[PDB]
Design a protein around this ligand. Structure first.
Ligand SMILES: [Zn+2]
Ligand SMILES: [Zn+2]
Length: 67
């Protein structure tokens, strides 16, 4: 499920203490803060409080909510 890498999957900037690593709880990828600034619940995983997701997973969720 979760993978790891040394850089953001969207912008390829390398993580460091000044640009920390974060995982998307929906897709398992790694992203910088700028590309994972939103959080959403993941009911299909039994998670009902907002957890961090990447922009792509956030859009997917938002599309379902306002469909
Ligand atoms: Zn990034
Ligand atoms: Zn994601």
């Amino acid at each position: 499920d979760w993978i790891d890498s040394d850089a953001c999957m969207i912008c390829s900037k390398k993580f460091s203490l000044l640009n920390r690593k974060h995982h998307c709880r929906s897709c398992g990828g790694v992203f910088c803060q700028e590309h994972s600034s939103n959080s959403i619940p993941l009911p299909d995983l039994g998670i009902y409080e907002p957890v961090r997701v990447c922009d792509s997973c956030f859009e997917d969720y938002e599309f379902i909510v306002t469909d």
